[PDB]
Each structure stands twice: as C-alpha cells, then as structure tokens.
Amino acid sequence: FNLISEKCDILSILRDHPENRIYRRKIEELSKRFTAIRKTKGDRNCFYRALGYSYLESLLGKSREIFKFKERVLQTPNDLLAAGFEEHKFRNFFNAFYSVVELVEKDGSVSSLLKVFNDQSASDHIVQFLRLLTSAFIRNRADFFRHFIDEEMDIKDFCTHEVEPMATECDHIQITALSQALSIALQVEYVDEMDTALNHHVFPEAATPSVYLLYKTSHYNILYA
Numbered sequence: 206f207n208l209i210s211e212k213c214d215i216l217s218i219l220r221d222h223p224e225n226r227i228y229r230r231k232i233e234e235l236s237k238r239f240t241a242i243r244k245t246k247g248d249r250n251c252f253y254r255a256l257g258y259s260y261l262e263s264l265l266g267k268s269r270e271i272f273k274f275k276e277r278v279l280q281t282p283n284d285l286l287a288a289g290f291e292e293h294k295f296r297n298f299f300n301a302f303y304s305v306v307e308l309v310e311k312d313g314s315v316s317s318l319l320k321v322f323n324d325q326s327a328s329d330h331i332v333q334f335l336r337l338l339t340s341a342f343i344r345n346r347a348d349f350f351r352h353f354i355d356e357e358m359d360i361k362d363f364c365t366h367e368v369e370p371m372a373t374e375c376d377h378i379q380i381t382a383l384s385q386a387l388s389i390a391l392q393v394e395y396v397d398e399m400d401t402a403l404n405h406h407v408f409p410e411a412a413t414p415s416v417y418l419l420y421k422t423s424h425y426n427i428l429y430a
C-alpha cells in the first residue's frame with residue numbers, strides 16, 4: 206500500500222503536525238464533517254492518482270453509472286486524436302485505463318481496485334492516460350481556458366510542460382479540465398497554516414460531489430464523508 210493507503214480515522218493525521226495550533230484546529234473541525242482518510246504517495250502524481258482511485262471506488266456496485274462512464278471512456282481516444290496525439294503512442298495508456306474500468310464492472314471489490322492502484326506499472330500507466338486526456342481536453346478548448354482562466358497564457362507550452370510529463374504539479378486549470386473531461390464532480394478542502402476559515406471549492410460549482418480531497422502542503426489525500 207505504498208501508493209494509496211488503507212483507510213484511517215481522520216484524527217490520525219494530528220501526528221503529522223504536532224504542536225501546531227492552526228493545523229490542530231482545522232483538522233479537529235474537518236473531523237466533524239469527515240470520518241476517514243486514505244493517504245497518497247507525494248511523488249508529483251498525487252492529484253491524478255487520488256482522483257482516479259476515489260472516483261472508480263465510488264462507482265462500485267452501481268450498474269447504470271458504470272455503463273454510462275464506460276460509454277464516455279470508449280470515446281476518449283477521439284479527444285486525443287482531435288488534439289494531435291497518435292494512436293500508437295497513447296494505446297498502452299488507454300488500454301490500462303479501460304482495463305481498470307472493466308475491473309470495477311466485472312470484479313467490483315475495493316481490494317482488487319486498491320491492488321491495481323498500488324501496482325507501480327498499472328497505476329503509473331493509468332496516471333499517464335489521465336495526464337494525456339487532461340492535455341487533450343485543454344488543447345481542444347483553448348479559447349475557453351484563455352477566456353475564463355487567463356487571456357495572457359500560452360496554452361500549448363503549458364500543456365507540454367505542466368500537464369503531460371509525469372510528476373508535474375496541478376493547479377485549478379488541470380482540476381477543472383479533468384473534471385469536465387470525465388464528468389467527475391469533486392470537492393477540495395483547503396488546510397493551510399494561516400489563521401483563517403477551513404474552506405472548500407466544488408468542481409463544477411453547482412454539482413453534488415462524488416469525490417472529496419484534502420489539499421495541504423502541495424499534497425492531495427482522499428476524504429470520506
């Protein structure tokens with residue numbers, strides 16, 4: 206369980222910031238709304254890895270929701286091709302993501318899903334697929350990302366340097382783009398060291414989330430309501 210942990214009690218993370226008044230306050234507050242946490246490896250891939258595992262976990266045993274998601278995943282090669290990725294270069298990554306989606310359908314156990322996401326090879330193939338899909342979705346909608354995010358930014362250079370490569374950190378743009386690309390609704394809780402309110406953001410703003418993540422010290426962990 207070196208990439209995604211077993212579930213722990215929310216208050217077990219007090220020990221990560223001992224004798225820190227603000228962390229202790231915000232974690233105690235968090236424990237009123239959430240019961241458990243799973244930790245991720247802090248290797249630069251933790252957003253993609255956490256979102257992939259937690260979303261697929263939320264689908265287990267839901268036959269209509271799995272059918273609908275599989276239907277969307279089967280179309281994603283078209284998004285990649287439209288943004289100028291070549292099939293023979295994304296094939297190995299697409300096949301690994303489609304395989305874990307079939308596991309959700311056919312096997313349906315937490316234990317099987319956690320084994321794939323802790324297999325360095327399968328898990329890293331899954332993360333690389335999610336990164337390529339994120340890049341494609343942004344490139345295919347460059348005017349939207351410039352209109353609504355940043356009129357001045359260079360989109361192609363951004364995707365080349367800060368989306369596609371393994372171990373590159375995310376910002377709001379990558380979270381919005383992957384959420385939209387796969388129709389995944391998520392909520393991020395923010396825990397920083399300023400004496401401020403514990404606060405969150407929902408992607409997209411009007412949605413009921415499937416996935417809850419905790420962001421602290423550049424790192425995303427998985428929360429359970």
Ligand SMILES: *CC(=O)NCC#Cc1cccc(C(F)(F)F)c1
Nearest residue numbers: 247248249250251252422423424
């Ligand atoms: C998403 C991601 O991979 N971020 C990199 C990181 C990190 C990190 C920050 C604070 C603590 C850890 C520990 F110690 F690994 F939990 C990792």
